[PDB]
Amino acid sequence: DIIIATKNGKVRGMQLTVFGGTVTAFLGIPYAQPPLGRLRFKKPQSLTKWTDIWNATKYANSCCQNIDQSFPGFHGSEMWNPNTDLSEDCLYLNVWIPAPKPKNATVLIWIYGGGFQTGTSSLHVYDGKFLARVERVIVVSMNYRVGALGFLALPGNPEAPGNMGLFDQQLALQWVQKNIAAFGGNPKSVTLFGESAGAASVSLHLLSPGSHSLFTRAILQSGSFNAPWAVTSLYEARNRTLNLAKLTGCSRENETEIIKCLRNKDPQEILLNEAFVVPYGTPLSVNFGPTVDGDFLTDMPDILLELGQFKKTQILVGVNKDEGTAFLVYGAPGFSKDNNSIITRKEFQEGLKIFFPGVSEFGKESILFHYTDWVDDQRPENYREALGDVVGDYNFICPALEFTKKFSEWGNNAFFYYFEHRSSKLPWPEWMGVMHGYEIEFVFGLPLERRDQYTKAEEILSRSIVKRWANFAKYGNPQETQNNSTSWPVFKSTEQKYLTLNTESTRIMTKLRAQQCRFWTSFFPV
Amino acid sequence: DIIIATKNGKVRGMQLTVFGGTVTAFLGIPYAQPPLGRLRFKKPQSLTKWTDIWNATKYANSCCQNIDQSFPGFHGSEMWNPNTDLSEDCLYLNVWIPAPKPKNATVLIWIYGGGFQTGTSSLHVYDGKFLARVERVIVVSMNYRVGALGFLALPGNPEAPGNMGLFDQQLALQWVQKNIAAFGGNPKSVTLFGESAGAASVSLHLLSPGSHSLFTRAILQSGSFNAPWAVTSLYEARNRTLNLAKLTGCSRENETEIIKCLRNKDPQEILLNEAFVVPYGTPLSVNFGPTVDGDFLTDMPDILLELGQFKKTQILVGVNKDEGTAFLVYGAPGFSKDNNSIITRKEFQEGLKIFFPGVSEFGKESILFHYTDWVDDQRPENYREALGDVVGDYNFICPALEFTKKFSEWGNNAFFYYFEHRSSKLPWPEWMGVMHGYEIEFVFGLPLERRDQYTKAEEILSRSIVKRWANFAKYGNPQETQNNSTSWPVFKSTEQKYLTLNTESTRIMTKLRAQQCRFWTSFFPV
Ligand SMILES: *[C@@H]1O[C@H](CO[C@H]2O[C@@H](C)[C@@H](O)[C@@H](O)[C@@H]2O)[C@@H](O[C@@H]2O[C@H](CO)[C@@H](O)[C@H](O)[C@H]2NC(C)=O)[C@H](O)[C@H]1NC(C)=O
Ligand SMILES: *[C@@H]1O[C@H](CO[C@H]2O[C@@H](C)[C@@H](O)[C@@H](O)[C@@H]2O)[C@@H](O[C@@H]2O[C@H](CO)[C@@H](O)[C@H](O)[C@H]2NC(C)=O)[C@H](O)[C@H]1NC(C)=O
Ligand SMILES: *[C@@H]1O[C@H](CO[C@H]2O[C@@H](C)[C@@H](O)[C@@H](O)[C@@H]2O)[C@@H](O[C@@H]2O[C@H](CO)[C@@H](O)[C@H](O)[C@H]2NC(C)=O)[C@H](O)[C@H]1NC(C)=O
Ligand SMILES: *[C@@H]1O[C@H](CO[C@H]2O[C@@H](C)[C@@H](O)[C@@H](O)[C@@H]2O)[C@@H](O[C@@H]2O[C@H](CO)[C@@H](O)[C@H](O)[C@H]2NC(C)=O)[C@H](O)[C@H]1NC(C)=O
Ligand SMILES: *[C@@H]1O[C@H](CO[C@H]2O[C@@H](C)[C@@H](O)[C@@H](O)[C@@H]2O)[C@@H](O)[C@H](O)[C@H]1NC(C)=O
Ligand SMILES: *[C@@H]1O[C@H](CO[C@H]2O[C@@H](C)[C@@H](O)[C@@H](O)[C@@H]2O)[C@@H](O)[C@H](O)[C@H]1NC(C)=O
Ligand SMILES: *[C@@H]1O[C@H](CO)[C@@H](O)[C@H](O)[C@H]1NC(C)=O
Ligand SMILES: *[C@@H]1O[C@H](CO)[C@@H](O)[C@H](O)[C@H]1NC(C)=O
Ligand SMILES: *[C@@H]1O[C@H](CO)[C@@H](O)[C@H](O)[C@H]1NC(C)=O
Ligand SMILES: *[C@@H]1O[C@H](CO)[C@@H](O)[C@H](O)[C@H]1NC(C)=O
Ligand SMILES: *[C@@H]1O[C@H](CO)[C@@H](O)[C@H](O)[C@H]1NC(C)=O
Ligand SMILES: *[C@@H]1O[C@H](CO)[C@@H](O)[C@H](O)[C@H]1NC(C)=O
Ligand SMILES: [Cl-]
Ligand SMILES: [Cl-]
Ligand SMILES: [Cl-]
Numbered sequence A, B: 001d002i003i004i005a006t007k008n009g010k011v012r013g014m015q016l017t018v019f020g021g022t023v024t025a026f027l028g029i030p031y032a033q034p035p036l037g038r039l040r041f042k043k044p045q046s047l048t049k050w051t052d053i054w055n056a057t058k059y060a061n062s063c064c065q066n067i068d069q070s071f072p073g074f075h076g077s078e079m080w081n082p083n084t085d086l087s088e089d090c091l092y093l094n095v096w097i098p099a100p101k102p103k104n105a106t107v108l109i110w111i112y113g114g115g116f117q118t119g120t121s122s123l124h125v126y127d128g129k130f131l132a133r134v135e136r137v138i139v140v141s142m143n144y145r146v147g148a149l150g151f152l153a154l155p156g157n158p159e160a161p162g163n164m165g166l167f168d169q170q171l172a173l174q175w176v177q178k179n180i181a182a183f184g185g186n187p188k189s190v191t192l193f194g195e196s197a198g199a200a201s202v203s204l205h206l207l208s209p210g211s212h213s214l215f216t217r218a219i220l221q222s223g224s225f226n227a228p229w230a231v232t233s234l235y236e237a238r239n240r241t242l243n244l245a246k247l248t249g250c251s252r253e254n255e256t257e258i259i260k261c262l263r264n265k266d267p268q269e270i271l272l273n274e275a276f277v278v279p280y281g282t283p284l285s286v287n288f289g290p291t292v293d294g295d296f297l298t299d300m301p302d303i304l305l306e307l308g309q310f311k312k313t314q315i316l317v318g319v320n321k322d323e324g325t326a327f328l329v330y331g332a333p334g335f336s337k338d339n340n341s342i343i344t345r346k347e348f349q350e351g352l353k354i355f356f357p358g359v360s361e362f363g364k365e366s367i368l369f370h371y372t373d374w375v376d377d378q379r380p381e382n383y384r385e386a387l388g389d390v391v392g393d394y395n396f397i398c399p400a401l402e403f404t405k406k407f408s409e410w411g412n413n414a415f416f417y418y419f420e421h422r423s424s425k426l427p428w429p430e431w432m433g434v435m436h437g438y439e440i441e442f443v444f445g446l447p448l449e450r451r452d453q454y455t456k457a458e459e460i461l462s463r464s465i466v467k468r469w470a471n472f473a474k475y476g477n478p479q480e481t482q483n484n485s486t487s488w489p490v491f492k493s494t495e496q497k498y499l500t501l502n503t504e505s506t507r508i509m510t511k512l513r514a515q516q517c518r519f520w521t522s523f524f525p526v
């Protein structure tokens, strides 16, 4: 029986057998006051003693959020949907620790993605018992509020100041600072890791003065705050808060009255109107996201990055080979998970409209000009491939490269990976390739479990990735030093070296997407 | 009607329509006295005026040589067999010139491979009318003697001094020096290019003081003199000359009598006994090859290379992804062009015996240790792939890399390519991959001919390669400057950058086969 005394009370955990060993999991520990009633849309408030043995033996509620009902019954999409009840009372975190209890273990804190509109820490692909077992690190993960409830912003107004879900993540990081030594953890060796919006969140904790001392290093998988979906302008946020108000009959003349009104709405009426706060959306819409609130984020983060105002530490950054494909089946014409999606030039052009709402005509021709000079015009999957690359390069890959470039110019070691392995079990079709989100199960070690029907080459790839992530967290260097592995070079402006992750053998290459990102990065920002 | 006056007489050529343009081909011009009778096994003797209009309107005889009868009826092998009559009277060359006649065109001189035992300039994949048409270079190619008739060596004895076939190539290069201005060529801009044994020959003309002033630059495709098959020791040559003598009842006590006796044998009795001058051969045997004769080759060429004694100029060097596969079907157990050749560990070991005759047991275990640590032992094509890589890395790839490394250390620009495109028309099976010999048709431009059933991506690849080879020859720099192409970096010890050639897009990479060649290059030379 395992009871740990925390600053706020005792917690009981549960033992887990993993790979003939034991991990202790403390699932669903609370880290803030439930943000209900009068606390809705406010910054999370600190938690007071229970006393009391809190039983942390199951995952807690996930935060309220719309769910993906596009493919009912389909594992590829439904695997991302919440797997605990939804509730505004969702501010909990999970701790997994090796057994026997470590002495001063390095801590890995996971921040989930989901567009800032969705996600939960209890997903199966985020289960941190493999990492704790195999690498003897402690893994922590937290639920933070998403959608309007986590990011609604009425700028400067503490009733809805914005970034609440980023302040939830932050209060979780404090909880680790204050409490993790009790579980056997080293609060001085804490690495944040996150994917997509979770990565973008990691990148903003790098810029946030209040997070500076809550962690040591950072890992960004498929995301960074400079991605075009990751920060809402003050203009847009205002328009959106008011549009939500209007749609819920909460329009007022006094803004504090708007918020008061919205605090009376049911979680569901808020969720139902989120999608419409915007005249046209895309499959990549982030209606309620991070904003420059003067608190968490003191200035437009592009200025902070350019001028070197951020936590000085090592970063590990990466992307997958086919980032953009996943999104094309949520609204691009001619695209289906259920056929090979060979689309036409005219369809490609219609797709640009779906993904680039407006976007001058000249803007959209320019994408077309850049991506459709074939070599050569023979290949029927030409336009289908091009639309996926457009969406991935713009939304994920070039913004990750440009973040890494700018961060490293201030003197810190940065490591960049290009993940190019398609899981043998991917439920999505072949044409979608190495999709967004599908490195995650490799990082968390799921392929280490033989009972699971991954290939042997995949077990070995995962084992290597886990070692590299763990050495990065413990030592700031993502090497696998024992098995004559390719040495991972730092990424510098100038050479821009990166490491490819695949089952055959990993290469050092240079200047990923050079020609493409010159387009997105220099020209497109029409 | 096109008549050119040469130092030795007039020659008439013939007009050819190529790609809606015209090339003039002068096929089968003689360049030495026929080396018959008393001239057999001797250095080629210069040619005296005919006078006389020599009609150069068809390919000449190929030199005597054994033929590959392993796959009668099969295009994959028979495409390499001679396509003109065999005859000791085979010392002719071919010239292709653009029309209209150029003013001072760069010259490309092709030296064929065939293990020094076979080959001919009249093969269809060596037809230089596409190059002349498309790049307005002049292409020259020569037949030189092969087998015992070209390389028999009784060291120091001018009746059989060795390297005769290398002196045939050399006298052809002089002929270009003396005569090519008459066809519109610049004798000051001459590039040699060659594949396999033809490349090895190019690399020895780089070391040969008598070739120094007969050319400007060099291209080596899949071969270099330091390959383990490319130079015969004086010991071996002596043993082999005597074994041949013995086998033809030509043994004598006086060595000049041996040669005199052999000069009385019929071409055929010599050819028939070549294969046996050696106790055990391999599919890569070179029974009669270059030797250190004190004339063409003044010292063991490994010493010349190490100590920087060679023509100081630019080189272009490359290899194909699957060099070693072609050879495995000529005697490795379990291998067939007619099935997927999945062999077993025990078969793999038997293969090493075929390819490494002797070769201590420890020598052969060491190859096995280096090439059979799988990742992982699951894959059934494991051993089949490993044997091909063993044979390619040892015989072609590492010796080409080590040549390039050592040549470049003395201060010259060198460019290295890794050719990784499998021809859409390859007649050999899929498991054999990107085979030895199959870049050649791309270099000569055959895919530029649409009537020919190559894909569009292959036309474009070939067009690019032709431009790069031509710019190398004309300007010492293998760039394709017009179509936003990847820039080809020089190869330096230290970074060892190389360019990949494939239909999708070409990459700059580093340290090809690093771990493998450390084995062949440092350790194996057991
Ligand atoms: C700020 O909002 C308006 C959209 O007004 C919205 O009303 C909301 C309650 C919601 O239902 C939403 O769907 C609706 O559009 C944006 O201007 C809109 O542009 C289109 C173009 O025809 C009009 O049809 C909309 O009605 C029009 N607004 C109106 C009704 O006046 C505006 O773009 C947006 N500003 C942004 C994009 O930041
Ligand atoms: C691949 O499928 C897409 C997706 O739309 C279809 O899904 C299919 C599996 C099928 O059940 C079909 O009924 C369903 O609508 C096809 O795109 C569609 O093309 C059809 C053919 O006319 C149009 O009617 C639809 O407007 C269009 N769907 C939309 C709204 O995007 C696509 O044609 C198909 N392409 C192939 C097989 O290459
Ligand atoms: C030099 O040659 C001998 C081989 O003697 C050869 O006689 C030739 C005419 C030819 O027919 C050839 O096939 C025959 O071998 C090499 O030594 C040989 O090694 C084997 C081992 O058992 C014996 O069976 C051979 O007969 C033996 N030579 C003899 C007959 O005395 C020798 O290796 C070779 N030297 C090299 C390799 O350079
Ligand atoms: C692939 O074929 C090889 C090559 O040998 C065979 O060629 C086949 C296409 C067939 O016509 C066969 O008759 C011919 O001998 C096979 O290797 C052979 O394996 C057979 C099976 O017993 C042996 O009897 C032979 O000794 C051996 N051939 C030699 C001398 O190398 C091989 O087994 C086959 N493998 C497959 C299908 O994976
Ligand atoms: C635990 O170690 C503390 C220092 O941690 C450093 O060492 C590594 C863990 C590294 O990753 C860095 O994060 C840190 O700088 C030390 O001060 C504590 O006293 C230790 N606590 C124990 C053992 O109780
Ligand atoms: C032909 O050019 C001669 C010099 O050739 C140089 O220029 C390039 C062709 C280059 O590749 C180098 O090989 C040479 O250094 C010049 O001396 C001759 O006079 C020219 N002959 C003519 C035009 O009749
Ligand atoms: C809390 O849960 C544990 C584990 O299931 C159980 O053994 C324990 O009795 C519980 N305590 C109470 C009564 O909350
Ligand atoms: C807006 O209304 C709120 C309701 O409490 C009040 O506190 C605030 O002072 C008002 N301000 C004005 C005058 O707009
Ligand atoms: C190293 O390789 C061994 C087997 O040779 C494997 O079992 C082990 O898990 C590997 N270690 C890492 C961290 O990759
Ligand atoms: C040489 O061959 C040409 C081309 O076929 C022919 O026209 C010419 O008359 C020939 N001259 C002689 C008689 O050798
Ligand atoms: C070897 O025989 C040849 C035959 O002409 C002769 O020239 C040479 O002098 C002889 N040398 C001796 C004595 O071995
Ligand atoms: C350049 O590309 C064009 C078409 O854009 C092609 O027709 C031409 O042959 C190319 N030139 C070379 C040398 O590759
Ligand atoms: Cl899963
Ligand atoms: Cl158009
Ligand atoms: Cl094409």
Ligand SMILES: [Cl-]
Residues within 6 Å of the ligand: A511, A512, A513, A514
């Ligand atoms: Cl790229």
Ligand SMILES: [Cl-]
Residues within 6 Å of the ligand: B079, B124, B125
């Ligand atoms: Cl052919």
Ligand SMILES: [Cl-]
Residues within 6 Å of the ligand: none
């Ligand atoms: Cl064994």
Ligand SMILES: [Cl-]
Residues within 6 Å of the ligand: A456, A457, B375, B376, B377, B378, B379
């Ligand atoms: Cl395997």
Ligand SMILES: [Cl-]
Residues within 6 Å of the ligand: B511, B512, B513, B514
């Ligand atoms: Cl390699």
Ligand code: NA
Residues within 6 Å of the ligand: A366, A523
């Ligand atoms: Na432009």
